[PDB]
Amino acid sequence: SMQVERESISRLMQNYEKINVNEITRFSDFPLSKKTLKGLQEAQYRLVTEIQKQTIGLALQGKDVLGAAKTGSGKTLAFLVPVLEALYRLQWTSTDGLGVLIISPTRELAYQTFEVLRKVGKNHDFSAGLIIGGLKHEAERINNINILVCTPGRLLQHMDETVSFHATDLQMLVLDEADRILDMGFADTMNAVIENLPKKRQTLLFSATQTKSVKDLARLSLKNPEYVWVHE
Ligand SMILES: Nc1ncnc2c1ncn2[C@@H]1O[C@H](COP(=O)(O)OP(=O)(O)O)[C@@H](O)[C@H]1O
Ligand SMILES: [Mg+2]
């Protein structure tokens, strides 16, 4: 297909240029698919937080973003909303393979992000899977998965020891809680993961804090990044 969805997508995209954060209080003030809006509304998410307001628009427009805001700010939806929309704009489906990698620092943090994604993205037609360790069972299922939520070590493992894993068609890389990723010692793991990905992609980096190392990474991982910070 689909001919109608192409028209709908085209209209959303014409409205990307007109995005103005001073006119945004609600998720529905951004130009978002009906499926994303339904999922947000069904999950009781209606008004945007400041970091969501200041980063979702730029991500919709295809830009690389470093978003910095303390814990509790709403960073998860700040990248998940753009993740869903990136694949929706392409009419991505389960047969299209790996479109988005979201990397979180620990198995519990990865799991928490995965749960938000499966609640808020439930009205979309993409597959989502969680890879966090704790084997071969995993590989069997994930070759077909559109959105993978991962921990850094397990992702690099899948990469190194799975012949069928490829990210040739990756659209977006997201680093969730990027300052913790780095403070755990995963800088070298991250660079190796990045060697296995296409340069052409969009990359979002979300961090709780302003650290030297995350700003350094924003140069290992990001193309002319849009820096955005929020406080108080
Ligand atoms: N737009 C919103 N409206 C109301 N609550 C929200 C919104 N976005 C996030 N939250 C809630 O605020 C809390 C923190 O969000 P979360 O993404 O985990 O923050 P962070 O990763 O920045 O620490 C969670 O309870 C989440 O459900
Ligand atoms: Mg978080």
Residue numbers in the entry: 45 to 178, 181 to 278
Which statements did the authors publish about this structure?
DExD/H-box RNA helicases, from virus and bacteria to eukaryotes, play important roles in processes including ribosome biogenesis, RNA processing and folding, ribonucleoprotein (RNP) remodeling, RNA nuclear export, the regulation of RNA translation and transcription, and nonsense-mediated RNA decay. DExD/H-box proteins often contain accessory regulatory domains and localization modules, but their cores consist of two RecA-like domains joined by a short flexible linker. The N-terminal domain is commonly referred to as conserved domain-1, or DEAD-domain, and the C-terminal domain as conserved domain-2, or helicase domain. Both domains contribute to the binding site for RNA substrates and both contribute to ATP hydrolysis. We used X-ray crystallography to determine the structures of the DEAD-domains of DDX2A, DDX2B, DDX5, DDX10, DDX18, DDX20, DDX47, DDX52, and DDX53, as well as the helicase domains of DDX25 and DDX41.
